[PDB]
């Protein structure tokens, strides 16, 4: 989210994320007003369940074209540069970046494909640069008549309106597999209290009772203690041993 330059929309980046703790709340501090559309999952309930892998795709698109990055949509960017599957679960975060990706002379480093033989399958990349023969005459690589280069440039300028200003877009995709979930968010904690009848939670283990200092000596790997009657009676504090 704090990278200096984002990849072009046609050659959109692909980042894999696994075995990490993700705090999505920070993503609410990007801009005072920004779109946070999420598909198949409520954003406020992203800190409890967790997934096996996360896919992040980042690029820059024109402001009025941001509506095409959604399942079931169509247009120019939707089928020629980046296609989203209909059975998609995840989130899209797009915010204005006019102060970082604008040149008075004009930004030409951002490119997008304009011509293609067919549409794009979901999650597909086309980085070809072959000339497009619009007509029937094969021009064999000269931009004459009925032969146009597939790529065009987003000539970004700060004097443009909001409908043409650049917008940075990051798409997060989640999924469920048989592999154990590993990308799980923070779980927080609370200060301990001793010698009083309280309700306690220890690593998902519920309980209610009085916590006292214990003379028992677990093995280093031991976590819980059970009595003769097969009930939990000794616990190891996850933070301090």
């Amino acid at each position, epitope marked *: 989210f704090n990278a200096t330059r984002f990849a072009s929309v046609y050659a959109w980046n692909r980042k894999r994320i696994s075995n990490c703790v993700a705090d999505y709340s920070v993503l609410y501090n990007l801009a005072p007003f920004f779109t946070f559309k999420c598909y198949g999952v409520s954003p406020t309930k992203l800190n409890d369940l967790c997934f096996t892998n996360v896919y992040a795709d980042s690029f820059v698109i024109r402001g009025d074209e941001v509506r095409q990055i959604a399942p079931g949509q169509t247009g120019n960017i939707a089928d020629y540069n980046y296609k989203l599957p209909d059975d998609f679960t995840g989130c899209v975060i797009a915010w204005n970046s006019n102060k970082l990706d604008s*040149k008075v*002379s004009g930004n030409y*480093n951002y490119l997008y494909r304009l011509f293609r033989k067919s549409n794009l399958k979901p999650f597909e990349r086309d980085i070809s640069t072959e000339i497009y023969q619009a007509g029937n005459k094969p021009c064999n690589g000269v931009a004459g008549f009925n032969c146009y280069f597939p790529l065009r440039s987003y000539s970004f300028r700060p004097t443009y309106g909001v409908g043409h200003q650049p917008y940075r877009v990051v798409v997060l995709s989640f999924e469920l597999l048989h592999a154990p979930a590993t990308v799980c968010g923070p779980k927080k904690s609370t200060n301990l209290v001793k010698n009083k009848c309280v309700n306690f939670n220890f690593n998902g283990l519920k309980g209610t009772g009085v916590l006292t200092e214990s003379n028992k000596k677990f093995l280093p790997f031991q976590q819980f203690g059970r009595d003769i009657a097969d009930t939990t009676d000794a616990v190891r504090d996850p933070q301090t041993l």
Partner: antibody
Amino acid sequence: QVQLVQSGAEVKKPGSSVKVSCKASGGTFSSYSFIWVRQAPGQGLEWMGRIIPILGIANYAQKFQGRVTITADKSTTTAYMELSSLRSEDTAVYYCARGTEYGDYDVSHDWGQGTLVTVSS
Amino acid sequence: DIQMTQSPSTLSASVGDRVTITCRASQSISSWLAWYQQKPGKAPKLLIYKASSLESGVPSRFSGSGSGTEFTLTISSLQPDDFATYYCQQYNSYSHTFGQGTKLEIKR
């Protein structure tokens, strides 16, 4: 990675046009942008022009309208700049520079060895 | 056009020293700036573009810092190969101007 070769030293009378070549070798050619810079012996550097051959945009410095034109050939994979109506204060080392799409067109990633160009009588 | 100045014009530093060079534009140029070093008689080489991004192959010791109209390049531990002429280059709006060129030398 990418190697740049420029022409040789050029000595001429003021009243003619001079053509300077710049050959770049390495990687895909269509992703490169070509920039031309001056360096007078008695002062620093000064930019003249930038060309994007795949998109066809040429942009020259304000004091160089009508005097310099920059083009490129994809078959030879080279860039050329021609400067006409030379004056005595135009003698300098000419530098060819390359910018990459992955990165920036405006910045100069690789530099040539330069060509010394002098005009006198 | 954008007129910018690099300061100080002349600096004397030594091996292992920590040095900085300031570079200020006339009006706002956002954060579009590049820095180049030149050996005497050799070709220029890029070090930092966007005023924060460090070009691959250049030692990580060089550090750029700036937001707009004011930029600095900092060197932590100087080496004898660091003596060169330093030029700025802004590429916001056309007519890309260069700097005066700071030459860094030893104390005799």
